[PDB]
Amino acid sequence: TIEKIMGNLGAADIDHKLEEQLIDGILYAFQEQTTEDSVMLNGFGTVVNALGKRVKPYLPQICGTVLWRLNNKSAKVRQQAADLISRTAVVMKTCQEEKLMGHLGVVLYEYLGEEYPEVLGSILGALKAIVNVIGMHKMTPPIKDLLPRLTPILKNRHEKVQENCIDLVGRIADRGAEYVSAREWMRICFELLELLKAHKKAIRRATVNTFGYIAKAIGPHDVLATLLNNLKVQERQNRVCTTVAIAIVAETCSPFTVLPALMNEYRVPELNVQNGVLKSLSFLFEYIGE
Amino acid sequence: LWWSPTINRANVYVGFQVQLDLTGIFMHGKIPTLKISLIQIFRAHLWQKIHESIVMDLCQVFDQELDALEIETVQKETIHPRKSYKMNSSCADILLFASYKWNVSRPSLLADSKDVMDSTTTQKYWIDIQLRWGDYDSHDIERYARAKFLDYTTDNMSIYPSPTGVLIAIDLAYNLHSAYGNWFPGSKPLIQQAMAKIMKANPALYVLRERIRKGLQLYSSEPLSSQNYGELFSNQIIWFVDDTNVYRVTIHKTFEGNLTTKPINGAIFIFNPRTGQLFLKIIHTSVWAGQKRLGQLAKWKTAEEVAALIRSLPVEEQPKQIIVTRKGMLDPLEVHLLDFPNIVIKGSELQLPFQACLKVEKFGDLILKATEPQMVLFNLYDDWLKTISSYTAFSRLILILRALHVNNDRAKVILKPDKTTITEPHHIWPTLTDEEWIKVEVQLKDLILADYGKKNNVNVASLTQSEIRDIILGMEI
Amino acid sequence: LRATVRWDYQPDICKDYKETGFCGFGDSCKFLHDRSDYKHGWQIERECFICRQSFQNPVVTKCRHYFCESCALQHFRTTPRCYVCDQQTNGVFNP
Amino acid sequence: KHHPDLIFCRKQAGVAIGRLCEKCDGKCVICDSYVRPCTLVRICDECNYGSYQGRCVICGGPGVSDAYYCKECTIQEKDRDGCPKIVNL
Amino acid sequence: MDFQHRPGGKTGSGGVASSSESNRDRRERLRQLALETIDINKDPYFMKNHLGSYECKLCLTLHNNEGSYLAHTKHQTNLARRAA
Numbered sequence A: 001t002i003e004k005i006m007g008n009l010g011a012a013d014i015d016h017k018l019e020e021q022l023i024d025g026i027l028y029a030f031q032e033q034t035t036e037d038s039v040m041l042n043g044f045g046t047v048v049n050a051l052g053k054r055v056k057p058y059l060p061q062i063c064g065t066v067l068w069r070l071n072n073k074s075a076k077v078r079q080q081a082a083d084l085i086s087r088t089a090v091v092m093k094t095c096q097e098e099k100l101m102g103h104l105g106v107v108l109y110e111y112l113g114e115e116y117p118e119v120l121g122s123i124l125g126a127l128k129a130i131v132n133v134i135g136m137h138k139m140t141p142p143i144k145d146l147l148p149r150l151t152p153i154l155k156n157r158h159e160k161v162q163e164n165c166i167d168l169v170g171r172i173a174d175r176g177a178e179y180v181s182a183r184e185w186m187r188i189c190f191e192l193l194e195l196l197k198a199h200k201k202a203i204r205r206a207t208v209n210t211f212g213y214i215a216k217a218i219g220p221h222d223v224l225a226t227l228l229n230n231l232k233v234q235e236r237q238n239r240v241c242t243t244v245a246i247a248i249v250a251e252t253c254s255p256f257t258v259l260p261a262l263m264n265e266y267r268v269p270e271l272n273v274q275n276g277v278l279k280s281l282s283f284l285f286e287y288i289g290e
Numbered sequence B: 001l002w003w004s005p006t007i008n009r010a011n012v013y014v015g016f017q018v019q020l021d022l023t024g025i026f027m028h029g030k031i032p033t034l035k036i037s038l039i040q041i042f043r044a045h046l047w048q049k050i051h052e053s054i055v056m057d058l059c060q061v062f063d064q065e066l067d068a069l070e071i072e073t074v075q076k077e078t079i080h081p082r083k084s085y086k087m088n089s090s091c092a093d094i095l096l097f098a099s100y101k102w103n104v105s106r107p108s109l110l111a112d113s114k115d116v117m118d119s120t121t122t123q124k125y126w127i128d129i130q131l132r133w134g135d136y137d138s139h140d141i142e143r144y145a146r147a148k149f150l151d152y153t154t155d156n157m158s159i160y161p162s163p164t165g166v167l168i169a170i171d172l173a174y175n176l177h178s179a180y181g182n183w184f185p186g187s188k189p190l191i192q193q194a195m196a197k198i199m200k201a202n203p204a205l206y207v208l209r210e211r212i213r214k215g216l217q218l219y220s221s222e223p224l225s226s227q228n229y230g231e232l233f234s235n236q237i238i239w240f241v242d243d244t245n246v247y248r249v250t251i252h253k254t255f256e257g258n259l260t261t262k263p264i265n266g267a268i269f270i271f272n273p274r275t276g277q278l279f280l281k282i283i284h285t286s287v288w289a290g291q292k293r294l295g296q297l298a299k300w301k302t303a304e305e306v307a308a309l310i311r312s313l314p315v316e317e318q319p320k321q322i323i324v325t326r327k328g329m330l331d332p333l334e335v336h337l338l339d340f341p342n343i344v345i346k347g348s349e350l351q352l353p354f355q356a357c358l359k360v361e362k363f364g365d366l367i368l369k370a371t372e373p374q375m376v377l378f379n380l381y382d383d384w385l386k387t388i389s390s391y392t393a394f395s396r397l398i399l400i401l402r403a404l405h406v407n408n409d410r411a412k413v414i415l416k417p418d419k420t421t422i423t424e425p426h427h428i429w430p431t432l433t434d435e436e437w438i439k440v441e442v443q444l445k446d447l448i449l450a451d452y453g454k455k456n457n458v459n460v461a462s463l464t465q466s467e468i469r470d471i472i473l474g475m476e477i
Numbered sequence C: 001l002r003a004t005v006r007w008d009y010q011p012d013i014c015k016d017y018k019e020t021g022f023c024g025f026g027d028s029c030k031f032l033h034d035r036s037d038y039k040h041g042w043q044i045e046r047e048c049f050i051c052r053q054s055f056q057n058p059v060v061t062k063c064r065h066y067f068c069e070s071c072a073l074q075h076f077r078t079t080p081r082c083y084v085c086d087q088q089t090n091g092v093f094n095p
Numbered sequence D: 001k002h003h004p005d006l007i008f009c010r011k012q013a014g015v016a017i018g019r020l021c022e023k024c025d026g027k028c029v030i031c032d033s034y035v036r037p038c039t040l041v042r043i044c045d046e047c048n049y050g051s052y053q054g055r056c057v058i059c060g061g062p063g064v065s066d067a068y069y070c071k072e073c074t075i076q077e078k079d080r081d082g083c084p085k086i087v088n089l
Numbered sequence E: 001m002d003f004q005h006r007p008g009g010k011t012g013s014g015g016v017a018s019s020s021e022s023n024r025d026r027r028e029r030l031r032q033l034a035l036e037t038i039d040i041n042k043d044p045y046f047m048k049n050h051l052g053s054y055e056c057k058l059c060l061t062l063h064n065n066e067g068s069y070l071a072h073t074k075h076q077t078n079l080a081r082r083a084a
């Protein structure tokens, strides 16, 4: 009811002691959360986003309580605390208190070595939110220290970890790719080839988008040779997504540069790469249109 | 890593002492796994960043109270980054230039309360901050602090701009802190509270503690009546500690319409419901006002007085529990209770009316007509406890306190309806027999029920027997 | 002002983990697994534009050359093309 | 990405607005593509009315986003073909 | 620790290949073994298609796998029919 009233009217009429009582009430409500009350998490996000810049005196108390609950025995408590970080990163960055958000990013970088998959996916989503609301230049720890830490996490087999980490890698490669050398990006592409054999279609779609972002960053030649070798090398219930990635790379990187190698790949008699060349051509034409 | 104070001892048979990279950690012999764990904790210049953040936090504190101690200016010593690693010699970290000639005492410990201050005088001041990684043999911080202070002031290699100053030593391996050196007046409780706040909530110290916790993979699983009015007679001494009467001032008026404030003596109440003993720790008339941090430093002085009274008391005289109220100034009380941890401070479902605890004539006359910390003790139910049990006398004392907090005239009429209820001078309650105190408690409960029905706009007799007994004992109703 | 510190001069980092992100030993690696480029302690301790006259009422012509209005009018009246790079400005004296 | 079964409604479209769940989000409702979401989806009739309010016009999950036609299906204007909500027959 | 009795590993290895790389290496080795046995047997009926498929010209039969042609050795009756 409080979330619906705040989303309907707003938080303009809230008094200062009333705001302190609301912050204490929602902190005790989050402190006693036995079930998976995600609508209560959305209500928390709605109340603090309606408050906006008035939560700046209450921010270190919220940060201290969340960082205390991140050391809990239960995995669900740590998952809920990282979800609260992911909800409140935007309103933490509205006041431009970059020291507290950078400290939270440093603590989450320390927490990146967790073994539980739901907790690790929640930490990755919170880090993705923090990078989206801060920007690359004032991001402590830096991207040149962050992405090598994210490189072995792509070898994980759990779906939520893969989805959140591929989303973070895609946000970095679309936005802040200048900090990372091309050798590391080629290592990312070689990991993304193994990531293409997943089960959720959103994981494969975001994988194809990361392939397009890396080819826009570093150049469309070596990644195209890697994708062509994967197309001629797979022979399984995948590799249509390899053709989708080839078409996305060509559409993002001026398809005159891609079409000689794709045309010369048709001469290989290996009975499956020609169908991949034709499927990539069809997806390329559907992507480029006129 | 978990037994690293014991494995990495300083007192060994043979060993070439070497310093670990970018730290002040000393190793005697190449132990590779310990070196790997301690390097993995202290990566990316964590030692220098911890020292820098502590220096900036102390600079922010001294800039926030620049005017209060006649300080002209504060200088951050922009120094080489290798100052935090060198244990052989140390420069100064924070420079203080004063407005006037500061009176400076001889060097002493941070915990030294007694300090005759008129040794010498000077203007400039230096503060040094030292970080150590103590082991099991040498986790003492105070003797390290005074030894480092003497070996840095006497030796010519350490450069200090003033002969008088202070050195602060922090042991990160045991999370201890101390200081040794000269003092100018007002600085000592400021540095004590600032160091308590810094070791409470430094960000880089939290980064270090989180790295240690993730290295060890540790987790914290922890995030009559059954309340405190009844648990005192349950073979557990629960002493209610109240410090809300420490900030007490009397009422007075001047010749004009404006009124002045009389600095009355502060009182700290320690009530034992299992024995009826109320100890009123008194304060001086010049200590309740004028000094800074009236809600913090006066509470810290009351906590120090309570810790001194607990240490003066025996082990059986010390309480096994503390029936505390809601915490408003109990952070320095819990910080200063390291030497007296036998009583656990917690907030149960039963409270006590401590504001009526000064309602006694003898205790009020002893507290008001004094100017020194006498720390007196009286009996709540001096004669009513011999005609009842421990819980019944505790409930009768709580009902008398609730009646005195409700209406003093009705409580005096119920307790002392005539001149035959005159007790001894050490007794707070009125003189009564068993049936006379039973009738006085019945009249006090009737007056308290009438006052509760007048305040809550309800009937006095509409409550249940358990609710009336909980309201008499001070619990929730 | 000498402040020499006897360091431990064996940085035990996995070179395969440091520049790749993958180690063949895995959890049985002798050295520690960390990817950073921070310096060590011993590395830190070891370390009218032709006549050059004034311009009044400036304006840019069709050849993207900015000059004074009288100078641009004289250049447009004297020659059909600009003197910057012989572009086809067609003697346009416009702001 | 289609199946030979599952004819949809073949009904005349109305003012009700289509709705997509996150499991099949971003897909075209006809040719199952992901290119140029141009034309909004109209779901004709009691596909919207009743217990199926705000549901998926595909598999049947709780819908979160507006469904769209792609530009390639509206090149031949297949969006006027009728309601695209799947009825399992 | 016993450094000379740990399991053997070399730096800069790259790790063990996945199931797809091992499967295509096994398929390439099976193709090499089938071609070696065809060249040892000197059978002229084996042909490789322009799309890259095994064909028996004496039987005029396509084969999906190498062992499909390796089991095509009916072929004697088809060879007797195609002999004339």
Ligand SMILES: [Zn+2]
Binding pocket: C014, C015, C016, C017, C023, C024, C025, C026, C029, C030, C031, C032, C033
């Ligand atoms: Zn390694």
Ligand SMILES: [Zn+2]
Binding pocket: D020, D021, D022, D023, D024, D025, D056, D057, D058, D059, D060, D061
């Ligand atoms: Zn759906």
Ligand SMILES: [Zn+2]
Binding pocket: D028, D029, D030, D031, D032, D033, D069, D070, D071, D072, D073
């Ligand atoms: Zn379509």
Ligand SMILES: [Zn+2]
Binding pocket: D008, D009, D011, D043, D044, D045, D047, D083, D084, D085
């Ligand atoms: Zn329909």
Ligand SMILES: [Zn+2]
Binding pocket: E045, E056, E058, E059, E060, E072, E074, E075, E078
């Ligand atoms: Zn044959």
